[PDB]
A paper describes a structure:
PA3825 is a two-domain cytoplasmic protein consisting of a structurally uncharacterised N-terminal CSS domain, with a predicted fold similar to the extracellular receptors of bacterial dimeric histidine kinases, and a PDE domain. The β5-α5 loop moves towards the active site and contributes to the formation of metal binding sites via two highly conserved Asp residues (Asp160–161). The restructuring of the β5-α5 loop and the functional role in metal coordination is thus conserved across different dimer interfaces.
DGC domains containing the signature GGDEF motif synthesise c-di-GMP from two GTP molecules while EAL1516 and HD-GYP171819 domain-containing PDEs are responsible for the hydrolysis of c-di-GMP to 5′-phosphoguanylyl-(3′-5′)-guanosine (pGpG). Hydrolysis of c-di-GMP by EAL domains has been shown to require the presence of divalent ions, either Mg2+ or Mn2+, with the most efficient reactions occurring at alkaline pH2933.
Numbering used by the authors: 5 to 260
Amino acid sequence: ASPSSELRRALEANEFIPYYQPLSPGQGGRWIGVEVLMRWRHPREGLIRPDLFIPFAERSGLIVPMTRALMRQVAEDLGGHAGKLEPGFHIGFNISATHCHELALVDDCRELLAAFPPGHITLVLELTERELIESSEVTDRLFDELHALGVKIAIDDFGTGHSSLAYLRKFQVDCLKIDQSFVARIGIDTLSGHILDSIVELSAKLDLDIVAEGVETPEQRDYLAARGVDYLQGYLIGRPMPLESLLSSLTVQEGQ
């Protein structure tokens, strides 16, 4: 029994499925994008969330082909429904460290964007600060080519002081994520509020967009809107959903 051969079997059998989590403007309104999350629809185990297998797939050496297949499925799922997406609609992916160490990522992005009318979507790739600190000439070239396509880069797991500012500036990152762990402590923990304020301050300094994760309550939403946070995701906005559910909801929003 080979876990790595099982992952390859699964990939060939199209068991890795995109689930779509909506992003909302901080001030409310129609969804402005989705973040794509890879689930494994395992015939015996049921639906498995990515934190339960992505780390192993990275170790196995399979994460890039899996992410490529995911990007391909999203093009097939949404590229024929551009009329349901308001121009500029964001489509976000979590990109693994190994995918960042290659230039094939540029071609993967170029292909996904070609499935929609030019400029119609904004592709957003989410990386960690480690990918900026542990960078090389490949990184420099990758970020420059992706930016020239109109791809935007979002960063998680970052510092907020002048040392981190230098990396964010060098690579001309576009967005910061607010981790759910800070959002969950809005109104309950003073320090967390200070951390959140520090992230907002860095964003203002570098003119970055902010996506806040794990937004579950109206209190959290209003706190974050009060600080100009651009985009929200979490239970309040909606859980990750299968394509059928997304299309149903988009149809409704196009009608209003």
